[PDB]
């Protein structure tokens, strides 16, 4: 029951993703070097990991069928509030339940609880973040479901500041019904079981993590000496 429009949408988003997610993580070199030794020793590197991921997410968002029909101001609001969430989602690709870490290439760009810890976020965030990663991993989404979920997350009507929330909703709906339908036609049981509802629930887990993140961001950034270790894009996106 996948219409030709819906196969189109999934074609676009797979390609959009492929163009914005290099699975060899080769650019991780242009990032300030990582340091594991250690008072916020990681902050410069991961700050650069996030800033970069921000860029890549924007690049994915622009190709979302319908995102272009939005105003520049609504495009702004949606990206500003989804950015970290979409980074958590896309990060699932490098995360592995082997040692509960994000394994990008190897060691020097393999990140873990104590690594993440050493960048200035507490365990009030990191513990539930990892939990999230474990549950999202276990759903074993089809990559098509992966990219549909990232796009659905970006195009959320309820984000504070939205104007044409109505046209935001229509673009999201088109993507939702595309996901609901894909799961039925392409996801075989038992994996298919309540899969959509379990994905929409990850969106709610994401809001909670974001809220925690936005609180501990205000914390790092109230100390200029920390704010001074970030990138300008991170400053601009996470509110300045």
């Amino acid at each position: 029951k996948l219409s030709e429009e819906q196969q189109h949408i999934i074609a676009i988003l797979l390609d959009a993703h492929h163009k914005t997610y290099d699975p060899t993580y080769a650019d991780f070199r242009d990032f300030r070097p990582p340091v594991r030794m250690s008072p916020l020793s990681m902050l410069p590197h991961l700050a650069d990991l996030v800033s970069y991921s921000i860029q890549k997410v924007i690049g994915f968002a622009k190709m979302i069928p319908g995102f272009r029909d939005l105003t520049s101001d609504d495009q702004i609001v949606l990206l500003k509030s989804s950015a970290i969430e979409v980074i958590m989602l896309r990060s699932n690709q490098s995360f592995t339940m082997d040692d509960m870490s994000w394994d990008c290439g190897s060691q020097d760009y393999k990140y873990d609880v104590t690594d993440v810890s050493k960048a200035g976020h507490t365990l009030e965030l990191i513990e539930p973040l990892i939990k999230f990663q474990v549950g999202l991993k276990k759903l074993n989404l089809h990559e098509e479901e992966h990219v549909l979920l990232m796009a659905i997350c970006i195009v959320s009507p309820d984000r504070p500041g939205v104007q044409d929330a109505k046209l935001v909703e229509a673009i999201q709906d088109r993507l939702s019904n595309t996901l609901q339908t894909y799961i039925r036609c392409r996801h075989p049981p038992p994996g298919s079981h309540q899969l959509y509802a379990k994905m929409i629930q990850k969106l709610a887990d994401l809001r909670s993590l974001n809220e925690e993140h936005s609180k501990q961001y205000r914390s790092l950034s109230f100390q200029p000496e920390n704010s001074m270790k970030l990138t300008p894009l991170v400053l601009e996106v996470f509110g300045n």
Partner: peptide
């Protein structure tokens, strides 16, 4: 807030 660089990456 006027976001220069986000605006530039979206255009």
């Amino acid at each position: 807030k006027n976001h220069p660089m986000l605006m530039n990456l979206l255009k």
